[PDB]
């Protein structure tokens, strides 16, 4: 008279990146190895009217 | 002067197999020859959140 072990099932976490979803269209992305070295950034537009 | 016997036909009860109905899509089957020798069974799931 046995008690059968019918199944051990482990869900698989699928890996998801940033460039593999459709939120990546809204922004362009650049690898920047030393970001904590950078303290602040700036862009400067020259608008001639 | 007579009385007639106008045929005899009996109903043929069709054999309704499990694998010919739609309720076999709701489940999946395994032929276990010896379920009398089973006291209990279990499935343990591992959910990785």
Q: What is the 3-state secondary structure (H, E, C) of B19-37?
A: HHCHHHCCCCCCCCCCHHH
Which among B39, B42, B48 has the least Cβ separation from residue A11? B48
DSSP A22: G
The Cα-based distances of A17 to A2, A14, A34, B15 in angstroms read 46, 10, 21, 54
Provide the resolution (angstroms). Answer: 4.1
Instruction: Tell me which residues of chain A, numbers 1 to 49, contact chain B at a CB-CB cutoff of 8 Å.
Output: 1-11, 13
Contact partners, residue A6, CB within 8 Å, separation at least 6: B41, B42, B43
DSSP A21: S
φ/ψ region of B7 (left if φ > 0, alpha if ψ in -120 to 50, else beta) reads: left
Task: State how far the Cα of A5 lies from the Cα of B37, in Å rounded to an integer.
Answer: 14
Contact partners, residue A13, CB within 8 Å, separation at least 6: B48
Method underlying the structure: cryo-EM
Task: State how far the Cα of A44 lies from the Cα of A41, in Å rounded to an integer.
Answer: 10
């Amino acid at each position: 008279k046995f008690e059968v072990l019918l199944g051990v099932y482990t869900n698989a976490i699928q890996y998801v990146r940033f460039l593999e979803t459709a939120l990546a269209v809204s922004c362009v992305n650049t690898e920047f190895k030393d970001l904590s070295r950078m303290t602040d950034g700036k862009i400067q537009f020259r608008i001639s009217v």
